[PDB]
Amino acid sequence: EPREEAGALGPAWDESQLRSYSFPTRPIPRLSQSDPRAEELIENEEPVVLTDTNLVYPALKWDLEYLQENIGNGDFSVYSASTHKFLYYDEKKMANFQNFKPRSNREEMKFHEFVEKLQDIQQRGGEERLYLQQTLNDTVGRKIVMDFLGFNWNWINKQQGKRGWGQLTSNLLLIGMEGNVTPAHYDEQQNFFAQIKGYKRCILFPPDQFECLYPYPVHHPCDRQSQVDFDNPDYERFPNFQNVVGYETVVGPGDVLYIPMYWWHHIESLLNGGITITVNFWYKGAPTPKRIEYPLKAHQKVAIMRNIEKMLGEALGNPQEVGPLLNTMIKGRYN
Amino acid sequence: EPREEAGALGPAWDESQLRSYSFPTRPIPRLSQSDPRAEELIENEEPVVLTDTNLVYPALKWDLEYLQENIGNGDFSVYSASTHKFLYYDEKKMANFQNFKPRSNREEMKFHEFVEKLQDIQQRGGEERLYLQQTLNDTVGRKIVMDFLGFNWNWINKQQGKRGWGQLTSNLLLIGMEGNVTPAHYDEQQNFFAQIKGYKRCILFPPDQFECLYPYPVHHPCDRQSQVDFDNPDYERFPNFQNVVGYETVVGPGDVLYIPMYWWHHIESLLNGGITITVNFWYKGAPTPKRIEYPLKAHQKVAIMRNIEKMLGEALGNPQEVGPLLNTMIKGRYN
Numbered sequence: 280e281p282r283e284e285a286g287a288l289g290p291a292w293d294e295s296q297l298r299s300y301s302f303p304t305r306p307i308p309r310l311s312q313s314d315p316r317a318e319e320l321i322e323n324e325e326p327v328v329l330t331d332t333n334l335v336y337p338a339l340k341w342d343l344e345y346l347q348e349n350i351g352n353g354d355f356s357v358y359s360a361s362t363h364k365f366l367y368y369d370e371k372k373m374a375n376f377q378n379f380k381p382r383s384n385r386e387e388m389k390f391h392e393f394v395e396k397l398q399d400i401q402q403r404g405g406e407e408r409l410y411l412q413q414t415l416n417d418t419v420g421r422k423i424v425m426d427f428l429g430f431n432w433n434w435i436n437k438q439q440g441k442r443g444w445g446q447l448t449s450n451l452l453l454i455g456m457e458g459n460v461t462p463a464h465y466d467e468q469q470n471f472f473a474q475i476k477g478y479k480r481c482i483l484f485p486p487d488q489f490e491c492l493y494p495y496p497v498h499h500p501c502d503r504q505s506q507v508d509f510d511n512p513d514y515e516r517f518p519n520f521q522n523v524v525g526y527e528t529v530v531g532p533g534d535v536l537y538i539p540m541y542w543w544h545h546i547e548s549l550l551n552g553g554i555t556i557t558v559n560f561w562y563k564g565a566p567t568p569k570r571i572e573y574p575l576k577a578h579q580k581v582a583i584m585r586n587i588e589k590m591l592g593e594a595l596g597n598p599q600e601v602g603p604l605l606n607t608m609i610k611g612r613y614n
Numbered sequence: 615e616p617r618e619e620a621g622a623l624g625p626a627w628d629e630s631q632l633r634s635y636s637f638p639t640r641p642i643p644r645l646s647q648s649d650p651r652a653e654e655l656i657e658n659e660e661p662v663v664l665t666d667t668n669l670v671y672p673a674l675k676w677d678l679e680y681l682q683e684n685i686g687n688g689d690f691s692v693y694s695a696s697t698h699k700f701l702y703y704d705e706k707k708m709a710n711f712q713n714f715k716p717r718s719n720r721e722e723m724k725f726h727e728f729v730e731k732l733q734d735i736q737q738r739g740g741e742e743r744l745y746l747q748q749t750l751n752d753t754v755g756r757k758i759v760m761d762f763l764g765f766n767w768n769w770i771n772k773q774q775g776k777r778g779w780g781q782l783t784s785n786l787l788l789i790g791m792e793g794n795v796t797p798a799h800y801d802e803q804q805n806f807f808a809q810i811k812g813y814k815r816c817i818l819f820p821p822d823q824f825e826c827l828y829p830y831p832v833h834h835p836c837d838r839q840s841q842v843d844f845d846n847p848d849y850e851r852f853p854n855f856q857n858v859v860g861y862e863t864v865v866g867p868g869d870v871l872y873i874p875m876y877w878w879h880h881i882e883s884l885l886n887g888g889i890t891i892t893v894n895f896w897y898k899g900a901p902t903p904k905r906i907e908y909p910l911k912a913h914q915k916v917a918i919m920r921n922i923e924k925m926l927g928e929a930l931g932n933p934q935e936v937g938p939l940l941n942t943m944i945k946g947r948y949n
């Protein structure tokens with residue numbers, strides 16, 4: 280339902296830049312950071328898009344030229360795909376599954392190399408696609424440390440304090456090609472997704488939709504991603520995917536999205552809309568209370584499930600025995 | 615394959631006193647207690663019938679008259695069934711399953727009351743059936759404490775020592791009516807089943823046949839019994855019951871059966887063969903080694919399964935949420 284930019288510059292995007300999927304969605308509310316309803320949503324761990332935080336104001340000038348000039352000669356992680364659809368592997372979990380080959384590999388490189396791959400691809404119709412995903416640190420240049428220093432630390436530190444969250448664990452810079460998709464997954468941390476350049480579509484699903492989204496086993500390298508291909512969903516294997524309902528929004532420069540911990544997210548950079556730049560802020564969640572309430576919340580049951588899987592992997596001495604044990608435990612007994 | 619008693623007294627039983635079932639079995643070996651192969655079997659936790667231990671020699675004179683005279687005015691637990699098939703409930707686990715009524719109840723009573731129920735039933739064709747099952751203690755009479763004192767404690771204490779087992783936890787006296795069946799279940803302790811009067815058929819199945827025998831959930835009051843009705847097995851729900859294979863034997867006066875911990879057992883007092891008397895000896899098993907070997911043994915995986923179920927019951931605050939969580943964790947992910 281497209282936003283009109285200030286100065287009559289016409290709709291920022293239209294519906295033809297959105298991919299189409301099998302499930303319905305409702306909109307994540309767009310609110311002011313001074314609106315108490317926004318504070319309610321965050322405190323109840325539900326998503327909201329805050330339109331006026333100024334969280335990353337000084338990075339609103341970033342583009343590829345400014346960045347290439349000012350970032351430094353660091354190594355930037357740069358992921359790859361032959362399709363629009365990216366797949367992250369945990370390279371430590373690779374010991375596990377023999378019957379396995381990378382199909383979206385990390386390449387290390389310097390920024391200018393990326394800017395030139397990027398723009399070479401462009402001049403050859405390439406379905407060959409790249410995603411830069413790299414922690415900001417100290418190895419970055421002077422003009423970028425200054426920018427970063429001007430982020431709205433007052434606001435975000437108040438949020439960490441008020442919500443009782445733990446420490447800021449990381450801050451990634453993400454630079455996407457148009458059409459790029461990061462398929463549905465969930466993160467264990469609380470997230471502020473700070474949009475800087477171009478437009479990203481975010482479809483979220485809550486923690487109680489675990490059973491419709493069929494993540495990989497915990498020991499699999501794609502731990503926490505959905506096994507369901509959103510473009511060609513296999514309802515024979517994943518029959519509850521036909522009961523999935525999402526929350527969605529499109530965020531552009533200046534918007535911040537609160538992605539609550541354990542919420543599923545699918546993130547797509549709009550078709551024909553250019554390069555997208557985003558920065559994220561990840562925090563450890565509050566510690567669990569002493570006072571346990573019953574019944575537990577979906578995320579807590581999700582946490583227990585992960586733990587059963589992790590323990591069983593260690594007790595059996597081999598993650599390939601986890602499946603057969605689980606199946607033996609449940610058939611003819613709990614169905 | 616029937617044993618001929620000493621003094622030409624003819625076969626002790628014939629095959630027509632055995633019920634018939636759907637699965638094949640092989641015989642548990644009958645050996646001398648002085649045979650090293652018997653010591654091998656016990657040390658490897660496999661069943662053996664020891665024919666000459668004298669473990670309960672002085673109780674070989676017990677019958678209902680001698681016992682009624684000499685046991686005392688104690689309360690004897692006495693279980694009931696309208697069918698040949700008994701069902702034990704754990705009365706503490708009854709809080710759990712609302713949708714539940716006893717169908718094989720404990721009645722307390724004095725021995726003479728039992729002897730008279732028993733013999734009244736007899737004079738009225740009754741499919742109404744009783745099983746006395748009660749720990750020996752100190753409240754028993756003088757002539758029975760003397761008998762008990764003459765059990766072969768030398769031999770059985772040597773076995774506890776050599777196997778590294780823990781303490782003797784209990785010693786039950788069991789007095790069964792003919793035709794009685796105790797359906798397949800497993801116990802967590804090591805067991806010497808000491809037969810005294812009449813004949814009992816014992817079909818055992820090892821720990822790695824868990825998946826064919828479909829025990830009740832751990833929180834169910836019939837925890838550790840098979841859900842499969844051996845007389846009318848439901849292969850739609852319990853399809854791997856058609857791969858079950860058993861070890862079987864018939865034990866009579868003077869025989870002792872080693873039932874290894876976690877081994878399934880089904881125990882039937884022969885049709886038309888009279889009242890049966892048995893005493894058992896249960897021991898805690900050895901503690902697990904420091905040196906863990908991989909892969910684990912079937913009983914150890916059975917122990918892990920029980921623990922996952924127990925924990926999850928407590929973490930969720932409600933055992934009815936265990937099933938749905940387990941199912942959500944496994945479908946489309948580990949099948």
Ligand SMILES: O=C(O)C(=O)c1cccc(O)c1
Pocket residue numbers: 453460461466470472538544546557559
């Ligand atoms: O923040 C995240 O959890 C995330 O998964 C993400 C953030 C920015 C772009 C993108 O493709 C993915």
Ligand SMILES: O=C(O)C(=O)c1cccc(O)c1
Pocket residue numbers: 788795796801805807873879881892894
């Ligand atoms: O010893 C046992 O584990 C047992 O289950 C048992 C012992 C004697 C008679 C009977 O019906 C059952």
Ligand SMILES: [Fe+2]
Pocket residue numbers: 464465466544
């Ligand atoms: Fe994420």
Ligand SMILES: [Fe+2]
Pocket residue numbers: 799800801879
């Ligand atoms: Fe038993």
